[PDB]
Amino acid sequence: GAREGPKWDPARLNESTTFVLGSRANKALGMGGTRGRIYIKHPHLFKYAADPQDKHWLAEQHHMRATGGKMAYLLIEEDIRDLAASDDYRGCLDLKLEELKSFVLPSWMVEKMRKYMETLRT
């Protein structure tokens, strides 16, 4: 097998396999970039804004309370493998989805995450 996924097969992942923040994400998507093929090439890439109340919990998982610099975002890790096949991310020497640091939201956060998605789902 290869190491271009979470463990062996990134496709096996579901729509709720995990979530990836918006910090240090460039790494998994090649550090040698400019803006982000995920925020341009993937105009249909699901994105969940980290509310001010949720940030409290996410901060514990991120282990870094960045006042600013960049806006964090929660995206389905499964959707990453797709965007990873972009024009640039396509087999990038600095592409390591295995270290996407993705994680599944708790039964608490998912609450607002579900009702929220419904807005962009229906």
UniProtKB/Swiss-Prot annotation:
Q: Which residues lie within the region annotated Important for DNA and nucleosome binding? A: 3-122
Subcellular localization: Nucleus
Q: Does the keyword Zinc belong to this entry? A: no
Q: Which UniProt keywords apply?
A: DNA-binding, Nucleus, Phosphoprotein, Transcription, Transcription regulation
Q: What is its main location?
A: nucleus
Q: Name residues in a coiled coil.
A: none
One GO cellular component this record assigns the protein to is: histone deacetylase complex
Q: What span is annotated as the signal peptide, if there is one?
A: none
GO molecular function ontology, one term from the record? nucleosome binding
Q: Any idea which residues the entry calls the DNA-binding region?
A: 22-43
Functional summary from the UniProt entry: Increases DNTT terminal deoxynucleotidyltransferase activity (in vitro). Also acts as a transcriptional regulator, binding to the consensus sequence 5'-GNTGCATG-3' following an AT-tract. Associates with RAB20 promoter and positively regulates its transcription. Binds DNA and nucleosomes; may recruit HDAC1 complexes to nucleosomes or naked DNA.
Query: What's the entry's take on its domains?
Result: The N-terminal domain mediates dimerization. The C-terminal domain mediates interaction with DNA and nucleosomes. It contains a HTH motif that mediates recognition of the consensus sequence.
State the oligomer form and interacting partners. Monomer and homodimer. A minor proportion may form homotrimers. Interacts with ZNF541. Interacts with the terminal deoxynucleotidyltransferase DNTT. Interacts with TRERF1. Identified in a histone deacetylase complex that contains DNTTIP1, HDAC1 and MIDEAS; this complex assembles into a tetramer that contains four copies of each protein chain. Component of a histone deacetylase complex containing DNTTIP1, ZNF541, HDAC1 and HDAC2. Identified in a complex with KCTD19, HDAC1, HDAC2 and ZNF541.
Q: What is this protein called?
A: Deoxynucleotidyltransferase terminal-interacting protein 1
**Which species?**
Homo sapiens
